[PDB]
Design a protein that fits this description.
The complex is a heterohexamer, with 3 copies of chain A (about 40 residues) and 3 copies of chain B (about 45 residues). Chain A has a single domain (about 1-40), classed as Single alpha-helices involved in coiled-coils or other helix-helix interfaces (Up-down Bundle). Helices cover about 80% and strands about 0% of the residues of chain A. Chain A has 1 helix and no strands. Chain A is rod-shaped, with a radius of gyration of 17 Å. Chain B is mainly α and about 45 residues long. Chain B has one domain (about 1-45): Light-harvesting Protein (Irregular), CATH 4.10.220.20. Helices cover about 65% and strands about 0% of the residues of chain B. Chain B is rod-shaped. Classes of the chains: A mainly alpha (about 40), B mainly alpha (about 45). Chains A and B meet through helix 1 of A and helix 1 of B. Bound molecules: bacteriochlorophyll A (7 copies) and rhodopinal glucoside (3 copies). One bacteriochlorophyll A sits at the interface of chains B and A. Chains A, D, F: The core complex is formed by different alpha and beta chains, binding bacteriochlorophyll molecules, and arranged most probably in tetrameric structures disposed around the reaction center. The non-pigmented gamma chains may constitute additional components. Chains A, D, F: Belongs to the antenna complex beta subunit family. Chains A, D, F: Keywords: Antenna complex, Bacteriochlorophyll, Cell inner membrane, Cell membrane, Chlorophyll, Chromophore, Light-harvesting polypeptide, Magnesium, Membrane, Metal-binding, Transmembrane, Transmembrane helix. Chains A, D, F: It is a single-pass type II membrane protein.
Chain lengths: ~40, ~45, ~45, ~40, ~45, ~40
């Protein structure tokens, strides 16, 4: 590919940034389930 | 968040799969670590 | 700081992900080290 | 890509340089949290 | 110092990140070495 | 990229060469801090 317009960039990143939170959230569940059933 | 203009500098067609890959790699590493410096991980698999 | 003109010499589209990658790599290394030359890191995971 | 104009270079680097400090700062917190709860 | 004309032979856009990378690599190596042939480095992390 | 004119080469290298000294200097501090607090 190529770079993006400043507009389509910012609009991609919107998605990159929910991706992440979806991750994070699921992580949290994990880490807690972990934390929970675990010597840690 | 504040950083979306990076795709104006870096071709998401290479850069995204980059990020997502390094995540996948990182998670295996972190597993690998914990697996080899606890007993209780490995214990789990038994 | 004083060094921004480097992107006039080096295509940030290759150079930035370079920097950011070497950071990510470096942090895993430094973890890896500390993990394998203390007890207290590993202790932590137990 | 390609290189940049001297103007758009310096303007990129502005961002590279907050990136870094954001890092640094968070590092500091880390190193202190570390330092704190730790034999180091 | 005397050597600047090298960029007339070698495209700083590949050559600079080369140098800077080999520095970064070298420093990790030298750390790695010292870490694994003293006690006092590792001692430090405890 | 491409190679450089003999003029823009020499002018790049000016920067390569402060980079280095900045490094060196900081190294020196390191090596001394080292030297100082250390069995070496
Ligand atoms: C080690 C301590 C605990 C434990 C505690 C935790 C904690 C705490 C966490 C996890 C997390 C996860 N663990 Mg664990 N977990 C344990 C044991 C296991 C076991 C096992 C059988 O041993 C397995 C299989 C898993 C599995 C998992 C995942 C479901 C999840 C991480 C996802 C990840 O990012 O994948 C990525 C890696 C891959 C290999 C998946 C790749 C699949 C896709 C198809 C490929 C992506 C493509 C990519 C390369 C790029 C493509 C880009 C596009 C083309 C543009 N766990 C032990 C018992 N686990 C993490 C999680 O919840 O994440 C939020 C987390 O925080
Ligand atoms: C070892 C001693 C202590 C401790 C002390 C410290 C100290 C001290 C510090 C950290 C730091 C960090 N530690 Mg630690 N920490 C410990 C144990 C852990 C554990 C664990 C389960 O063992 C984890 C998961 C972490 C996690 C972390 C991170 C949150 C953070 C470093 C971030 C980094 O740069 O990531 C980068 C690496 C990755 C794998 C992340 C990659 C994710 C993204 C999506 C990919 C980036 C993409 C890149 C490749 C290029 C793309 C460019 C664009 C496309 C253009 N620590 C132990 C207990 N920790 C550092 C921090 O605070 O940083 C400021 C720090 O200073
Ligand atoms: C081993 C003996 C002593 C000690 C004695 C010394 C001495 C003596 C020195 C150092 C030096 C350094 N040490 Mg030490 N130090 C010790 C323990 C540590 C610990 C640790 C937690 O164990 C850490 C994290 C450090 C950290 C450091 C660095 C701050 C510094 C080297 C910088 C370097 O070149 O990075 C580069 C490597 C990286 C991973 C950084 C990369 C970051 C950037 C973003 C990437 C650059 C990009 C590159 C790949 C190319 C891009 C080019 C452009 C795109 C064009 N030390 C022990 C206790 N240390 C050296 C220093 O002062 O240097 C002058 C030095 O001389
Ligand atoms: C027994 C359970 C184990 C354990 C087992 C595992 C396993 C297994 C996994 C994790 C996972 C993670 N663990 Mg853990 N984990 C443990 C305890 C910890 C500890 C701790 C010190 O207590 C820490 C700090 C962490 C931290 C983390 C995360 C770094 C990571 C999940 C990412 C996430 O969702 O981010 C969500 C993203 C965010 C919300 C981003 C926010 C960005 C902010 C705002 C910062 C800006 C960026 C900044 C400037 C840095 C620039 C980075 C550049 C690329 C260099 N865990 C214990 C010890 N953990 C998972 C993982 O690492 O996935 C790869 C995983 O698979
Ligand atoms: C600095 C403050 C700015 C900001 C500045 C930057 C900068 C600068 C950069 C990013 C970068 C990123 N940011 Mg941002 N960013 C911000 C806000 C966010 C938010 C948000 C607030 O919701 C999200 C989802 C993201 C998402 C992202 C990722 C897509 C990307 C790399 C993440 C990563 O590696 O972090 C690494 C993770 C951390 C250092 C923190 C570790 C995760 C947290 C701390 C703990 C996870 C909890 C875990 C589940 C449980 C742990 C339990 C144990 C007790 C510890 N940013 C704010 C507005 N952002 C990077 C980028 O785009 O490069 C490609 C980058 O360089
Ligand atoms: C138990 C706790 C452990 C430990 C665990 C960890 C872990 C875990 C991590 C760190 C991290 C870091 N640690 Mg530590 N750390 C410890 C103690 C130390 C000691 C010490 C000797 O006491 C040192 C020197 C450091 C130093 C560092 C940094 C190099 C690094 C965070 C980068 C940062 O935010 O920069 C912010 C950036 C700056 C502000 C840049 C300033 C630039 C200046 C002006 C210099 C110009 C550049 C110069 C010329 C060099 C050119 C470089 C070229 C590329 C070659 N830590 C103890 C022993 N530390 C993190 C890391 O390395 O991330 C990858 C990380 O994940
Ligand atoms: C406990 C402390 C440890 C130690 C821990 C570390 C750590 C940790 C690091 C160093 C670092 C360095 N150490 Mg030490 N170091 C120790 C003791 C020494 C000893 C010694 C024999 O006593 C030596 C010779 C060195 C030498 C060096 C440097 C090579 C390097 C810093 C580079 C620098 O700033 O250059 C500045 C640059 C110059 C001014 C250049 C001058 C150029 C001249 C004019 C020559 C022309 C070039 C010539 C023709 C060669 C061509 C090269 C081609 C590419 C092949 N240290 C002790 C044993 N040291 C750092 C390092 O290597 O960084 C990667 C680093 O991270
Ligand atoms: C050894 C040891 C102990 C190690 C431990 C140490 C360390 C350092 C551990 C480290 C832990 C860390 C830091 C972990 C990291 C966690 C992080 C995890 C991140 C996760 C991110 C995820 C899952 C991201 C997901 C994102 C996704 C799926 C993206 C989706 C986006 C799309 C589908 C885009 C949609 C297209 C759109 C609508 C925008 O539209 C399109 O725009 C284009 C231009 O913009 C146009 O050309 C095109 O015509 C148009 O169609 C954050 O980064
Ligand atoms: C084994 C062992 C013991 C090892 C230990 C040893 C060693 C050596 C350890 C080493 C430790 C060290 C040195 C660690 C390093 C730490 C450092 C960490 C650095 C972190 C940096 C980070 C997180 C950087 C983040 C930067 C980011 C996210 C950048 C953002 C920038 C953007 C989004 C750009 C915005 C675009 C902009 C607005 C400028 O605009 C655009 O400009 C272009 C041209 O310029 C135009 O063409 C385009 O049309 C336009 O849209 C520093 O480097
Ligand atoms: C196992 C074991 C024991 C191992 C130990 C052994 C060994 C061998 C150990 C080795 C140790 C050694 C030798 C270590 C090495 C140390 C060294 C370290 C070096 C460090 C160097 C550094 C940090 C360099 C930094 C340089 C930087 C940041 C460069 C900056 C330059 C710029 C920003 C350029 C500015 C652009 C400019 C103004 C010139 O302008 C531009 O010019 C172009 C053409 O010229 C034009 O086309 C463009 O339009 C215009 O804008 C030296 O090299």
């Amino acid at each position: 590919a190529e770079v993006l317009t400043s507009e389509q960039a910012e609009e991609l990143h919107k998605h990159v940034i929910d991706g992440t939170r979806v991750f994070l959230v699921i992580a949290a569940i994990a880490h807690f389930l972990a934390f929970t059933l675990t010597p840690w | 968040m504040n950083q979306g203009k990076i795709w104006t500098v870096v071709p998401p067609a290479f850069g995204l799969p980059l990020m997502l890959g390094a995540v996948a790699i990182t998670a295996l590493l972190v597993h690998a670590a914990v697996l080899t410096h606890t007993t209780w991980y490995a214990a789990f698999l038994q």
